[PDB]
Amino acid sequence: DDFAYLNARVRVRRGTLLKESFFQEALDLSFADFLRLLSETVYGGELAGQGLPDVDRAVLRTQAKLVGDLPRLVTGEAREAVRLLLLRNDLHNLQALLRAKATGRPFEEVLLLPGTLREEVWRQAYEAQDPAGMAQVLAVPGHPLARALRAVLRETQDLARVEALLAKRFFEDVAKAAKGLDQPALRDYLALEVDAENLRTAFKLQGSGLAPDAFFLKGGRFVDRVRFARLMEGDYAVLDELSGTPFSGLSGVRDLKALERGLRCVLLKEAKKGVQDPLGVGLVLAYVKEREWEAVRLRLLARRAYFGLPRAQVEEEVVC
């Protein structure tokens, strides 16, 4: 409820962040220098041993320690708001769970990264006869995925098209809840994420020839459904049509790698606008996205040091 008592610990955690020189000096290391610098870092407090997998497990434990508590320590409308910040890992865990239930591998098959609800609920959801019964076992009150999967659950028993339509309805109900809050910037950031995901589905499905209206979603403000069909066709001018919006530098690109790189750049730049709101909740969302950019930078530098990457090989990864 209190968007300030959490904001104080948010400012404290914002005080615990690495500078750009911490990665700029990390452009030249040999994973032992990187291990020593991470040993200086707070994320190396869970530093178990040596090796890339130990480094990634320590990074996941540090992310759970510094980022997982934000889902806790709050109650009310602020809890309903801050729940829809670290939601991608939860939807990914639910998607892997649906894939495992439809596939047939072991319930300990996927590694089940940390999200919002109890992992014991995810273990208990491995055994459920009805999909609606599994949804009710996974039903939290303010979980948007619980309301999304139940509404999408009135089609069949367990289908992959049900899973894709459930992801579409998940993004749709996320946009509906983002419109259904008293937050001036969280709705804008969620809508920017929705339009970027629409562009990402368009670039991933460009040339597929499928139905774009079945692929296009609702909730954005930066593009059009006709612009969506133009992006579905081989027309980069629609990507050039993005002028004045946050999709500014996204122009003249056809390769999806640098396209989604600049998309993440625009998303992080919009997330940088969250420091303007010291009283609401978007500052905490900015802190979460900052830890996310730090996490991408950490696993990137970890891969670079473990495989000996060139500085030119990852030069397009720290430009913003």
Next chain:
Amino acid sequence: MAVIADPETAQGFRLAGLEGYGASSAEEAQSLLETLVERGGYALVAVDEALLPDPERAVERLMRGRDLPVLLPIAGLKEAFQGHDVEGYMRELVRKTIGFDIKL
């Protein structure tokens, strides 16, 4: 099919829909090689160069006949900054094959 290089390498192949294994030591690489040879896997096995250079040994000891799990000394990615020295591999191959190394 199947490959063995490294868990970080093998998870890309498992993402291809292709059976992966991964061993840090060369003896464990022949162990996993022996595993998929005894569990005769669809006839192809790729092996990284860094673990086994010429991995013919397990199949010539075990499956001397039938030529079936085809071996490949594939290149590893931390070494694929160099690019295997493909010409030197080919020289080594013809010298192994017909004995007589010459210049192409």
Next chain:
Amino acid sequence: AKEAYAALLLAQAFDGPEVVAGAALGVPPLEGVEAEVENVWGSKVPRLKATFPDGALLSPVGTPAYTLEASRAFRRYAEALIRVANTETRLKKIGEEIKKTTRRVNALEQVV
């Protein structure tokens, strides 16, 4: 190889390790390769054909983005892999057939 390992490094760097484990444990049927017949100078040799579950791919709405580029990458990787396999096996058999002929020539000459 260099393009596919680059795509895999980028997808595991940016997107999480656990989610690429989760998207890769969900599997296409992975099989389909077969060792069909080739006949080269008195010897059948196995010529492999492709795997082909690539008509059946997961996540039509690709929920990660850089990971699906790696799932597209390692199919081209495995295809170039089986091409190298069913060229090098022919080269093996031709080379050893030849050196067999030379040892039969020298045996036949210097004895009979």
